[PDB]
PDB file of C-alpha atoms and ligand atoms in Angstrom:
ATOM      1  CA  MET A   1     -15.779  43.485 -61.158  1.00 38.15           C
ATOM      2  CA  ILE A   2     -17.426  40.671 -59.128  1.00 40.03           C
ATOM      3  CA  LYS A   3     -19.102  42.319 -56.152  1.00 42.38           C
ATOM      4  CA  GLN A   4     -20.018  40.817 -52.786  1.00 41.47           C
ATOM      5  CA  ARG A   5     -23.626  39.630 -52.392  1.00 41.93           C
ATOM      6  CA  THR A   6     -26.326  39.471 -49.708  1.00 42.37           C
ATOM      7  CA  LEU A   7     -29.998  38.621 -49.198  1.00 43.12           C
ATOM      8  CA  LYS A   8     -32.571  40.942 -50.795  1.00 44.51           C
ATOM      9  CA  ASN A   9     -35.207  40.031 -48.160  1.00 41.61           C
ATOM     10  CA  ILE A  10     -35.875  38.137 -44.935  1.00 44.20           C
ATOM     11  CA  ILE A  11     -36.491  34.363 -44.940  1.00 50.43           C
ATOM     12  CA  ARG A  12     -37.910  32.220 -42.154  1.00 52.03           C
ATOM     13  CA  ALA A  13     -38.009  28.446 -41.952  1.00 46.07           C
ATOM     14  CA  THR A  14     -38.919  26.006 -39.194  1.00 44.70           C
ATOM     15  CA  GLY A  15     -38.011  22.311 -38.798  1.00 41.69           C
ATOM     16  CA  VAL A  16     -36.215  19.968 -36.320  1.00 43.34           C
ATOM     17  CA  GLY A  17     -32.622  19.133 -35.361  1.00 42.69           C
ATOM     18  CA  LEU A  18     -31.528  15.669 -36.632  1.00 40.58           C
ATOM     19  CA  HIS A  19     -29.232  15.254 -33.559  1.00 39.65           C
ATOM     20  CA  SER A  20     -31.017  17.540 -31.048  1.00 40.47           C
ATOM     21  CA  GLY A  21     -34.626  16.695 -32.128  1.00 42.16           C
ATOM     22  CA  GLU A  22     -35.774  20.157 -30.879  1.00 40.03           C
ATOM     23  CA  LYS A  23     -38.048  22.505 -32.883  1.00 41.89           C
ATOM     24  CA  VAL A  24     -36.046  25.521 -34.130  1.00 44.71           C
ATOM     25  CA  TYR A  25     -36.832  28.752 -36.050  1.00 46.64           C
ATOM     26  CA  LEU A  26     -34.198  29.937 -38.553  1.00 43.52           C
ATOM     27  CA  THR A  27     -34.289  33.547 -39.732  1.00 45.83           C
ATOM     28  CA  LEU A  28     -31.951  34.875 -42.405  1.00 45.62           C
ATOM     29  CA  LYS A  29     -31.361  38.595 -42.635  1.00 45.08           C
ATOM     30  CA  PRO A  30     -29.185  40.725 -44.918  1.00 42.52           C
ATOM     31  CA  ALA A  31     -25.822  41.962 -43.500  1.00 45.27           C
ATOM     32  CA  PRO A  32     -23.271  44.690 -44.488  1.00 48.63           C
ATOM     33  CA  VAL A  33     -20.097  44.344 -46.652  1.00 46.70           C
ATOM     34  CA  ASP A  34     -17.089  42.457 -45.101  1.00 47.33           C
ATOM     35  CA  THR A  35     -19.439  40.901 -42.494  1.00 45.45           C
ATOM     36  CA  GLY A  36     -19.337  37.202 -43.508  1.00 46.08           C
ATOM     37  CA  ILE A  37     -21.797  34.627 -42.069  1.00 45.82           C
ATOM     38  CA  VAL A  38     -22.705  35.124 -38.395  1.00 45.09           C
ATOM     39  CA  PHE A  39     -24.653  32.546 -36.399  1.00 46.75           C
ATOM     40  CA  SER A  40     -26.709  34.035 -33.585  1.00 49.33           C
ATOM     41  CA  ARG A  41     -28.564  32.253 -30.738  1.00 51.83           C
ATOM     42  CA  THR A  42     -31.434  34.723 -30.129  1.00 49.12           C
ATOM     43  CA  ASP A  43     -33.115  32.632 -27.366  1.00 48.23           C
ATOM     44  CA  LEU A  44     -30.288  33.648 -24.962  1.00 47.48           C
ATOM     45  CA  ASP A  45     -30.025  36.818 -22.784  1.00 48.97           C
ATOM     46  CA  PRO A  46     -27.904  38.450 -24.058  1.00 48.51           C
ATOM     47  CA  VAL A  47     -27.806  37.081 -27.657  1.00 51.87           C
ATOM     48  CA  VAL A  48     -24.642  34.991 -28.472  1.00 51.18           C
ATOM     49  CA  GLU A  49     -23.018  35.714 -31.858  1.00 50.51           C
ATOM     50  CA  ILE A  50     -20.621  33.094 -33.317  1.00 53.29           C
ATOM     51  CA  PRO A  51     -19.135  34.262 -36.621  1.00 54.88           C
ATOM     52  CA  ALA A  52     -18.736  31.303 -39.086  1.00 51.27           C
ATOM     53  CA  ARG A  53     -14.884  30.858 -39.153  1.00 50.33           C
ATOM     54  CA  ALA A  54     -12.565  27.801 -39.062  1.00 52.96           C
ATOM     55  CA  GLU A  55     -11.254  28.830 -35.588  1.00 55.00           C
ATOM     56  CA  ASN A  56     -14.787  28.840 -34.072  1.00 53.69           C
ATOM     57  CA  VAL A  57     -15.311  25.146 -35.017  1.00 52.61           C
ATOM     58  CA  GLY A  58     -14.905  23.029 -31.854  1.00 55.63           C
ATOM     59  CA  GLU A  59     -16.973  19.849 -32.389  1.00 56.43           C
ATOM     60  CA  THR A  60     -16.749  17.737 -35.597  1.00 57.13           C
ATOM     61  CA  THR A  61     -18.789  14.803 -34.190  1.00 56.12           C
ATOM     62  CA  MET A  62     -21.042  13.754 -37.157  1.00 55.92           C
ATOM     63  CA  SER A  63     -21.821  17.499 -37.798  1.00 55.47           C
ATOM     64  CA  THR A  64     -19.918  20.804 -37.923  1.00 55.60           C
ATOM     65  CA  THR A  65     -20.256  22.753 -34.665  1.00 56.02           C
ATOM     66  CA  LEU A  66     -19.246  26.361 -33.882  1.00 58.99           C
ATOM     67  CA  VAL A  67     -18.178  27.018 -30.229  1.00 57.17           C
ATOM     68  CA  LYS A  68     -18.120  30.258 -28.296  1.00 56.74           C
ATOM     69  CA  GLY A  69     -17.465  29.013 -24.734  1.00 56.42           C
ATOM     70  CA  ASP A  70     -20.376  26.830 -23.464  1.00 53.55           C
ATOM     71  CA  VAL A  71     -22.800  27.940 -26.259  1.00 52.52           C
ATOM     72  CA  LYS A  72     -22.763  25.943 -29.508  1.00 55.75           C
ATOM     73  CA  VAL A  73     -24.589  26.059 -32.868  1.00 53.02           C
ATOM     74  CA  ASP A  74     -24.816  22.516 -34.304  1.00 54.58           C
ATOM     75  CA  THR A  75     -25.007  20.957 -37.840  1.00 50.80           C
ATOM     76  CA  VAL A  76     -24.059  24.116 -39.847  1.00 52.06           C
ATOM     77  CA  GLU A  77     -22.703  22.498 -43.064  1.00 50.53           C
ATOM     78  CA  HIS A  78     -25.724  22.211 -45.504  1.00 52.52           C
ATOM     79  CA  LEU A  79     -26.969  25.822 -45.160  1.00 53.13           C
ATOM     80  CA  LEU A  80     -23.357  27.145 -45.505  1.00 55.32           C
ATOM     81  CA  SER A  81     -23.051  25.230 -48.868  1.00 53.26           C
ATOM     82  CA  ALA A  82     -26.385  26.605 -50.213  1.00 52.25           C
ATOM     83  CA  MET A  83     -24.966  30.002 -49.309  1.00 53.48           C
ATOM     84  CA  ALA A  84     -21.590  28.916 -50.832  1.00 54.02           C
ATOM     85  CA  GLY A  85     -23.523  27.584 -53.862  1.00 54.89           C
ATOM     86  CA  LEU A  86     -25.610  30.700 -54.615  1.00 54.63           C
ATOM     87  CA  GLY A  87     -22.625  32.858 -53.547  1.00 55.55           C
ATOM     88  CA  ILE A  88     -24.107  34.621 -50.508  1.00 52.88           C
ATOM     89  CA  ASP A  89     -21.052  36.414 -49.057  1.00 57.09           C
ATOM     90  CA  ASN A  90     -22.725  38.091 -46.007  1.00 54.34           C
ATOM     91  CA  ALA A  91     -25.938  37.176 -44.110  1.00 57.38           C
ATOM     92  CA  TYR A  92     -27.201  37.118 -40.496  1.00 60.27           C
ATOM     93  CA  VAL A  93     -28.336  33.637 -39.331  1.00 62.39           C
ATOM     94  CA  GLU A  94     -30.513  33.473 -36.206  1.00 62.27           C
ATOM     95  CA  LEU A  95     -31.439  30.249 -34.317  1.00 60.48           C
ATOM     96  CA  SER A  96     -34.132  29.682 -31.618  1.00 60.14           C
ATOM     97  CA  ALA A  97     -32.303  26.420 -30.607  1.00 60.87           C
ATOM     98  CA  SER A  98     -28.657  25.164 -30.633  1.00 60.64           C
ATOM     99  CA  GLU A  99     -29.017  23.056 -33.859  1.00 58.37           C
ATOM    100  CA  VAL A 100     -29.931  24.245 -37.397  1.00 57.92           C
ATOM    101  CA  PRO A 101     -32.981  22.543 -38.988  1.00 58.45           C
ATOM    102  CA  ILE A 102     -32.271  19.402 -41.056  1.00 56.64           C
ATOM    103  CA  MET A 103     -35.087  20.434 -43.549  1.00 55.71           C
ATOM    104  CA  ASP A 104     -35.372  17.471 -46.040  1.00 51.82           C
ATOM    105  CA  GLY A 105     -31.637  16.535 -45.478  1.00 50.73           C
ATOM    106  CA  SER A 106     -30.302  18.438 -48.556  1.00 52.13           C
ATOM    107  CA  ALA A 107     -29.292  22.067 -49.287  1.00 52.84           C
ATOM    108  CA  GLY A 108     -32.483  22.229 -51.495  1.00 52.83           C
ATOM    109  CA  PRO A 109     -34.989  24.025 -49.128  1.00 50.40           C
ATOM    110  CA  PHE A 110     -32.423  26.784 -48.409  1.00 50.78           C
ATOM    111  CA  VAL A 111     -31.695  27.172 -52.185  1.00 52.87           C
ATOM    112  CA  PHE A 112     -35.463  27.544 -52.829  1.00 51.52           C
ATOM    113  CA  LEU A 113     -35.743  29.948 -49.841  1.00 54.14           C
ATOM    114  CA  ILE A 114     -32.748  32.093 -51.080  1.00 55.35           C
ATOM    115  CA  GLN A 115     -33.722  32.023 -54.789  1.00 57.02           C
ATOM    116  CA  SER A 116     -37.280  33.318 -53.951  1.00 58.22           C
ATOM    117  CA  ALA A 117     -36.085  36.103 -51.552  1.00 57.27           C
ATOM    118  CA  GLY A 118     -33.322  37.154 -54.023  1.00 58.98           C
ATOM    119  CA  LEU A 119     -29.642  38.229 -54.129  1.00 60.66           C
ATOM    120  CA  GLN A 120     -28.396  41.849 -53.699  1.00 65.70           C
ATOM    121  CA  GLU A 121     -25.001  43.076 -55.049  1.00 65.97           C
ATOM    122  CA  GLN A 122     -22.936  45.534 -52.981  1.00 67.65           C
ATOM    123  CA  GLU A 123     -20.316  48.197 -53.767  1.00 66.49           C
ATOM    124  CA  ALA A 124     -17.284  46.142 -52.708  1.00 66.87           C
ATOM    125  CA  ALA A 125     -15.025  43.683 -54.529  1.00 67.69           C
ATOM    126  CA  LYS A 126     -15.530  40.016 -53.550  1.00 70.59           C
ATOM    127  CA  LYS A 127     -12.377  38.597 -51.956  1.00 73.25           C
ATOM    128  CA  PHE A 128     -11.187  35.158 -53.094  1.00 72.37           C
ATOM    129  CA  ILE A 129      -8.445  32.980 -51.602  1.00 76.24           C
ATOM    130  CA  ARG A 130      -6.305  31.695 -54.520  1.00 76.33           C
ATOM    131  CA  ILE A 131      -4.343  28.447 -53.873  1.00 72.50           C
ATOM    132  CA  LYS A 132      -0.648  29.012 -54.864  1.00 69.37           C
ATOM    133  CA  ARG A 133       0.744  25.506 -53.948  1.00 68.89           C
ATOM    134  CA  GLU A 134      -0.646  22.128 -52.769  1.00 71.22           C
ATOM    135  CA  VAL A 135      -1.676  21.700 -49.080  1.00 69.38           C
ATOM    136  CA  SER A 136      -2.613  18.272 -47.587  1.00 70.94           C
ATOM    137  CA  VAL A 137      -3.621  16.430 -44.382  1.00 69.99           C
ATOM    138  CA  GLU A 138      -3.759  12.708 -43.502  1.00 72.71           C
ATOM    139  CA  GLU A 139      -5.555  10.990 -40.638  1.00 70.10           C
ATOM    140  CA  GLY A 140      -5.015   7.206 -40.809  1.00 67.80           C
ATOM    141  CA  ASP A 141      -6.981   5.901 -43.867  1.00 65.30           C
ATOM    142  CA  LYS A 142      -8.751   9.273 -44.665  1.00 65.61           C
ATOM    143  CA  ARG A 143      -7.037  12.039 -46.717  1.00 68.18           C
ATOM    144  CA  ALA A 144      -7.720  15.619 -47.949  1.00 68.22           C
ATOM    145  CA  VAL A 145      -5.960  18.141 -50.213  1.00 68.43           C
ATOM    146  CA  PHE A 146      -6.005  21.614 -51.767  1.00 68.52           C
ATOM    147  CA  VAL A 147      -4.339  21.885 -55.198  1.00 68.16           C
ATOM    148  CA  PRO A 148      -4.285  24.654 -57.885  1.00 72.21           C
ATOM    149  CA  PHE A 149      -7.112  24.834 -60.514  1.00 71.40           C
ATOM    150  CA  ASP A 150      -8.262  27.813 -62.653  1.00 67.32           C
ATOM    151  CA  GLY A 151     -11.779  27.931 -61.066  1.00 69.83           C
ATOM    152  CA  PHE A 152     -13.315  25.824 -58.271  1.00 68.60           C
ATOM    153  CA  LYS A 153     -13.405  22.022 -58.597  1.00 73.60           C
ATOM    154  CA  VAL A 154     -14.413  19.479 -55.941  1.00 72.48           C
ATOM    155  CA  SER A 155     -13.458  15.858 -56.579  1.00 70.31           C
ATOM    156  CA  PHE A 156     -14.426  13.070 -54.201  1.00 67.23           C
ATOM    157  CA  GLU A 157     -13.891   9.331 -53.716  1.00 68.29           C
ATOM    158  CA  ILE A 158     -15.168   7.096 -50.892  1.00 68.55           C
ATOM    159  CA  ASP A 159     -14.665   3.457 -49.864  1.00 69.32           C
ATOM    160  CA  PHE A 160     -18.067   2.719 -48.244  1.00 67.63           C
ATOM    161  CA  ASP A 161     -17.992  -0.884 -46.925  1.00 69.70           C
ATOM    162  CA  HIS A 162     -21.658  -1.764 -47.532  1.00 73.23           C
ATOM    163  CA  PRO A 163     -23.540  -4.301 -49.746  1.00 75.58           C
ATOM    164  CA  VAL A 164     -25.713  -1.625 -51.476  1.00 75.76           C
ATOM    165  CA  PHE A 165     -22.597  -0.172 -53.207  1.00 71.95           C
ATOM    166  CA  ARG A 166     -21.898  -3.607 -54.947  1.00 68.47           C
ATOM    167  CA  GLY A 167     -18.311  -3.653 -53.528  1.00 71.50           C
ATOM    168  CA  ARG A 168     -17.496  -0.568 -55.670  1.00 71.24           C
ATOM    169  CA  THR A 169     -16.226   2.791 -54.402  1.00 69.85           C
ATOM    170  CA  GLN A 170     -18.043   6.015 -55.303  1.00 71.83           C
ATOM    171  CA  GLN A 171     -16.512   8.877 -57.321  1.00 71.28           C
ATOM    172  CA  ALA A 172     -17.815  12.268 -58.588  1.00 69.34           C
ATOM    173  CA  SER A 173     -15.903  15.397 -59.734  1.00 69.20           C
ATOM    174  CA  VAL A 174     -17.813  18.715 -60.024  1.00 68.00           C
ATOM    175  CA  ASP A 175     -16.821  22.008 -61.712  1.00 69.12           C
ATOM    176  CA  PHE A 176     -18.237  24.887 -59.614  1.00 70.34           C
ATOM    177  CA  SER A 177     -21.080  26.936 -61.158  1.00 70.59           C
ATOM    178  CA  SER A 178     -24.330  28.295 -59.610  1.00 70.45           C
ATOM    179  CA  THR A 179     -26.083  26.076 -62.241  1.00 69.92           C
ATOM    180  CA  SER A 180     -23.500  23.314 -61.636  1.00 72.92           C
ATOM    181  CA  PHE A 181     -24.273  23.422 -57.881  1.00 73.03           C
ATOM    182  CA  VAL A 182     -28.093  23.674 -58.094  1.00 71.86           C
ATOM    183  CA  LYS A 183     -28.860  21.003 -60.703  1.00 72.27           C
ATOM    184  CA  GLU A 184     -26.312  18.255 -59.766  1.00 73.67           C
ATOM    185  CA  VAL A 185     -25.081  18.834 -56.100  1.00 72.31           C
ATOM    186  CA  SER A 186     -27.873  20.712 -54.191  1.00 74.62           C
ATOM    187  CA  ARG A 187     -30.584  17.967 -53.680  1.00 72.81           C
ATOM    188  CA  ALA A 188     -28.172  15.266 -52.315  1.00 73.60           C
ATOM    189  CA  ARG A 189     -29.889  14.191 -49.034  1.00 74.15           C
ATOM    190  CA  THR A 190     -27.948  13.047 -45.951  1.00 78.14           C
ATOM    191  CA  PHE A 191     -27.674   9.302 -45.306  1.00 77.65           C
ATOM    192  CA  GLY A 192     -27.882   7.053 -42.282  1.00 78.72           C
ATOM    193  CA  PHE A 193     -27.052   3.344 -42.049  1.00 76.21           C
ATOM    194  CA  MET A 194     -29.096   1.145 -39.660  1.00 77.66           C
ATOM    195  CA  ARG A 195     -25.977  -0.096 -37.701  1.00 76.57           C
ATOM    196  CA  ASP A 196     -24.864   3.454 -36.613  1.00 76.44           C
ATOM    197  CA  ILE A 197     -28.506   4.678 -36.267  1.00 78.51           C
ATOM    198  CA  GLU A 198     -29.499   2.096 -33.549  1.00 79.68           C
ATOM    199  CA  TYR A 199     -26.987   3.138 -30.780  1.00 79.52           C
ATOM    200  CA  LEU A 200     -27.625   6.937 -31.221  1.00 81.21           C
ATOM    201  CA  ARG A 201     -31.475   6.873 -30.671  1.00 79.88           C
ATOM    202  CA  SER A 202     -31.529   4.492 -27.607  1.00 81.20           C
ATOM    203  CA  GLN A 203     -29.343   7.217 -26.034  1.00 80.98           C
ATOM    204  CA  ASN A 204     -31.771   9.985 -27.229  1.00 79.20           C
ATOM    205  CA  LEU A 205     -29.107  11.115 -29.783  1.00 80.83           C
ATOM    206  CA  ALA A 206     -29.828  11.623 -33.559  1.00 76.58           C
ATOM    207  CA  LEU A 207     -33.565  11.427 -32.587  1.00 73.01           C
ATOM    208  CA  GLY A 208     -34.433  13.855 -35.486  1.00 70.99           C
ATOM    209  CA  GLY A 209     -33.744  11.699 -38.642  1.00 71.02           C
ATOM    210  CA  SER A 210     -36.418   9.630 -40.498  1.00 75.98           C
ATOM    211  CA  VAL A 211     -37.422   8.713 -44.105  1.00 75.20           C
ATOM    212  CA  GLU A 212     -38.978  12.215 -44.273  1.00 74.69           C
ATOM    213  CA  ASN A 213     -35.602  14.044 -44.010  1.00 71.04           C
ATOM    214  CA  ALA A 214     -32.850  11.398 -44.464  1.00 68.46           C
ATOM    215  CA  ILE A 215     -31.750   8.203 -46.264  1.00 70.02           C
ATOM    216  CA  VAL A 216     -32.349   5.151 -44.070  1.00 68.01           C
ATOM    217  CA  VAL A 217     -30.277   2.331 -45.512  1.00 69.33           C
ATOM    218  CA  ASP A 218     -30.573  -1.350 -44.599  1.00 69.82           C
ATOM    219  CA  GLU A 219     -28.149  -4.100 -45.748  1.00 66.28           C
ATOM    220  CA  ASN A 220     -30.594  -5.331 -48.465  1.00 65.73           C
ATOM    221  CA  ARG A 221     -31.358  -1.935 -50.124  1.00 66.65           C
ATOM    222  CA  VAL A 222     -32.339   1.754 -49.596  1.00 67.58           C
ATOM    223  CA  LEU A 223     -35.614   1.535 -47.582  1.00 69.29           C
ATOM    224  CA  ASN A 224     -36.979   4.939 -48.798  1.00 69.81           C
ATOM    225  CA  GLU A 225     -39.850   3.969 -51.140  1.00 70.88           C
ATOM    226  CA  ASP A 226     -38.600   6.276 -53.967  1.00 71.70           C
ATOM    227  CA  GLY A 227     -34.862   5.340 -53.770  1.00 69.36           C
ATOM    228  CA  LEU A 228     -32.248   7.964 -54.804  1.00 69.53           C
ATOM    229  CA  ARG A 229     -32.822  11.467 -56.259  1.00 68.09           C
ATOM    230  CA  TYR A 230     -29.606  10.957 -58.244  1.00 67.78           C
ATOM    231  CA  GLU A 231     -28.003   7.592 -59.214  1.00 67.86           C
ATOM    232  CA  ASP A 232     -24.952   9.369 -57.695  1.00 70.79           C
ATOM    233  CA  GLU A 233     -26.646  10.649 -54.446  1.00 73.27           C
ATOM    234  CA  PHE A 234     -24.364   9.478 -51.547  1.00 72.05           C
ATOM    235  CA  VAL A 235     -21.045  10.780 -52.927  1.00 73.27           C
ATOM    236  CA  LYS A 236     -22.575  14.058 -54.300  1.00 73.73           C
ATOM    237  CA  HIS A 237     -23.809  14.820 -50.722  1.00 71.38           C
ATOM    238  CA  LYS A 238     -20.304  14.265 -49.323  1.00 72.84           C
ATOM    239  CA  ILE A 239     -19.450  17.019 -51.894  1.00 73.21           C
ATOM    240  CA  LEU A 240     -22.421  19.058 -50.562  1.00 72.29           C
ATOM    241  CA  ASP A 241     -20.889  18.555 -47.063  1.00 74.15           C
ATOM    242  CA  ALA A 242     -17.266  19.544 -47.965  1.00 72.57           C
ATOM    243  CA  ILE A 243     -18.357  22.762 -49.769  1.00 72.81           C
ATOM    244  CA  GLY A 244     -20.123  23.824 -46.524  1.00 70.13           C
ATOM    245  CA  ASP A 245     -17.102  23.221 -44.232  1.00 71.91           C
ATOM    246  CA  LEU A 246     -14.581  24.876 -46.588  1.00 70.41           C
ATOM    247  CA  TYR A 247     -16.764  28.048 -46.609  1.00 68.09           C
ATOM    248  CA  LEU A 248     -15.799  28.493 -42.920  1.00 65.85           C
ATOM    249  CA  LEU A 249     -12.568  29.844 -44.464  1.00 65.54           C
ATOM    250  CA  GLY A 250     -14.871  32.888 -44.687  1.00 66.69           C
ATOM    251  CA  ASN A 251     -13.967  33.441 -48.337  1.00 62.75           C
ATOM    252  CA  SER A 252     -14.610  31.694 -51.652  1.00 65.37           C
ATOM    253  CA  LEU A 253     -11.810  29.444 -52.972  1.00 67.61           C
ATOM    254  CA  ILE A 254     -10.018  29.299 -56.341  1.00 64.67           C
ATOM    255  CA  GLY A 255      -8.454  25.843 -56.282  1.00 68.01           C
ATOM    256  CA  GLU A 256      -9.231  22.169 -56.800  1.00 66.28           C
ATOM    257  CA  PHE A 257     -10.054  20.214 -53.652  1.00 66.63           C
ATOM    258  CA  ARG A 258      -9.879  16.407 -53.448  1.00 68.08           C
ATOM    259  CA  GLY A 259     -11.338  14.375 -50.575  1.00 68.87           C
ATOM    260  CA  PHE A 260     -10.815  10.640 -50.004  1.00 66.68           C
ATOM    261  CA  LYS A 261     -13.014   9.227 -47.222  1.00 67.88           C
ATOM    262  CA  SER A 262     -12.656  12.761 -45.743  1.00 69.82           C
ATOM    263  CA  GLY A 263     -15.104  13.994 -43.066  1.00 68.27           C
ATOM    264  CA  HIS A 264     -15.957  17.130 -41.065  1.00 69.67           C
ATOM    265  CA  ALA A 265     -12.818  16.797 -38.882  1.00 69.89           C
ATOM    266  CA  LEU A 266     -10.347  16.717 -41.780  1.00 69.59           C
ATOM    267  CA  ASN A 267     -12.293  19.437 -43.692  1.00 70.09           C
ATOM    268  CA  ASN A 268     -11.854  21.877 -40.773  1.00 69.21           C
ATOM    269  CA  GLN A 269      -8.260  20.545 -40.356  1.00 70.39           C
ATOM    270  CA  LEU A 270      -7.211  21.479 -43.924  1.00 69.19           C
ATOM    271  CA  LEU A 271      -8.566  25.035 -43.484  1.00 68.90           C
ATOM    272  CA  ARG A 272      -6.426  25.821 -40.405  1.00 71.58           C
ATOM    273  CA  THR A 273      -3.454  23.997 -41.986  1.00 72.29           C
ATOM    274  CA  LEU A 274      -3.977  26.171 -45.114  1.00 71.60           C
ATOM    275  CA  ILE A 275      -4.228  29.563 -43.279  1.00 70.87           C
ATOM    276  CA  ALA A 276      -0.992  28.766 -41.413  1.00 71.43           C
ATOM    277  CA  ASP A 277       0.716  28.152 -44.805  1.00 67.51           C
ATOM    278  CA  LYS A 278       0.653  31.850 -45.842  1.00 66.91           C
ATOM    279  CA  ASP A 279       3.099  31.074 -48.719  1.00 64.90           C
ATOM    280  CA  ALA A 280       0.407  28.581 -49.893  1.00 66.96           C
ATOM    281  CA  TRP A 281      -2.264  31.249 -50.667  1.00 69.00           C
ATOM    282  CA  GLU A 282      -2.926  34.849 -51.760  1.00 71.75           C
ATOM    283  CA  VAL A 283      -6.070  37.039 -51.878  1.00 75.06           C
ATOM    284  CA  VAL A 284      -7.568  37.955 -55.287  1.00 77.72           C
ATOM    285  CA  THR A 285     -10.488  39.985 -56.622  1.00 78.90           C
ATOM    286  CA  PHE A 286     -11.662  40.297 -60.236  1.00 81.49           C
ATOM    287  CA  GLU A 287     -12.197  43.335 -62.487  1.00 78.33           C
ATOM    288  CA  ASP A 288     -14.466  41.579 -65.048  1.00 79.58           C
ATOM    289  CA  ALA A 289     -16.915  38.645 -64.862  1.00 78.01           C
ATOM    290  CA  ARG A 290     -14.967  37.262 -67.919  1.00 78.65           C
ATOM    291  CA  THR A 291     -11.483  37.471 -66.243  1.00 75.94           C
ATOM    292  CA  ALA A 292     -13.003  35.641 -63.247  1.00 75.02           C
ATOM    293  CA  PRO A 293     -13.153  31.869 -63.772  1.00 77.59           C
ATOM    294  CA  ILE A 294     -16.390  31.280 -61.716  1.00 74.77           C
ATOM    295  CA  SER A 295     -20.015  32.137 -62.691  1.00 76.56           C
ATOM    296  CA  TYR A 296     -22.622  32.935 -59.987  1.00 74.22           C
ATOM    297  CA  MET A 297     -26.391  33.169 -60.692  1.00 77.43           C
ATOM    298  CA  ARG A 298     -26.906  36.827 -61.694  1.00 78.27           C
ATOM    299  CA  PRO A 299     -28.841  38.727 -58.973  1.00 78.16           C
TER     300      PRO A 299
HETATM  301  C1  FYF B   1     -24.677  15.578 -40.833  1.00 78.52           C
HETATM  302  C2  FYF B   1     -23.920  15.562 -42.163  1.00 78.52           C
HETATM  303  O1  FYF B   1     -24.204  16.756 -42.901  1.00 78.52           O
HETATM  304  C3  FYF B   1     -24.309  14.380 -42.972  1.00 78.52           C
HETATM  305  N1  FYF B   1     -24.886  14.425 -44.188  1.00 78.52           N
HETATM  306  C4  FYF B   1     -25.088  13.165 -44.615  1.00 78.52           C
HETATM  307  C5  FYF B   1     -24.637  12.343 -43.638  1.00 78.52           C
HETATM  308  N2  FYF B   1     -24.157  13.098 -42.648  1.00 78.52           N
HETATM  309  C6  FYF B   1     -23.581  12.555 -41.421  1.00 78.52           C
HETATM  310  C7  FYF B   1     -24.700  12.237 -40.464  1.00 78.52           C
HETATM  311  C8  FYF B   1     -25.822  11.438 -40.709  1.00 78.52           C
HETATM  312  C9  FYF B   1     -26.578  11.419 -39.554  1.00 78.52           C
HETATM  313  C10 FYF B   1     -27.864  10.755 -39.283  1.00 78.52           C
HETATM  314  C11 FYF B   1     -28.302  10.624 -37.974  1.00 78.52           C
HETATM  315  C12 FYF B   1     -29.527  10.021 -37.711  1.00 78.52           C
HETATM  316  C13 FYF B   1     -30.324   9.569 -38.757  1.00 78.52           C
HETATM  317  C14 FYF B   1     -29.888   9.724 -40.064  1.00 78.52           C
HETATM  318  C15 FYF B   1     -28.660  10.331 -40.328  1.00 78.52           C
HETATM  319  O2  FYF B   1     -25.898  12.211 -38.689  1.00 78.52           O
HETATM  320  N3  FYF B   1     -24.779  12.716 -39.200  1.00 78.52           N
HETATM  321 ZN1   ZN B   2     -24.577  16.331 -44.723  1.00 77.21          ZN
END
């Protein structure tokens, strides 16, 4: 059987919030079976715990944000994908500030942090949500969908309206593997365009992004002196982003997902729409690693 997993040791990392621009300390600790991913604000008296679920997501404004009343934990998506990517089922996440550190803009620093600390298996079957029939959501020109697949597949397609793209639209379609996630999806940095970036900073918003942790794009070309990590970088990241928001289902998925100019808002939207469609899904666990159609990096 495929067992649930956790962290073998404690990991600490410190950086800044892209949006908040405040220094923050992130500590990851192992948690028990059936726990899931819990975000904790440990600078507050008493400490405020927001479990990472679809129903705790309030704000989808250029970041995924969990809300418990007037306390919020901001920009959760990258870390939750690293954890989705390496298959961390249960871990305690503790923040000194409201927003999670942007690191170098990818899920890469968290992968390197989790790979070094190590994975621990647990005596409990790992629950999966299996997609029985197609579920969809539309919002104007943006679209998102869950469809059956024997494994996990994320396909994506985006109509960026920028000169750098050469009038073309971007498309990537990944088959989920630990190896598949690390080598081709994990290092896809976040991107900023100069038009959107100007109005945020003058208002002391998005003060945290720079060449050091993001892609700063001007009309003429990508200003970062070493260009793109992948030829494919922008669209892969949007895949890095979707994996992180879907994992607020609280369980791993066994279906193909397709996004078309889909964002945080729609990603959270499909989850709730899915859960409501009980006929749409069932829970499944696996007796053998072979029976199971998904391979995670062995502990
Ligand atoms: C935040 C989300 O995970 C993301 N990844 C890539 C792009 N995005 C959207 C996004 C990008 C920015 C941004 C803000 C200021 C500077 C650079 C970038 O803020 N939200
Ligand atoms: Zn992102």
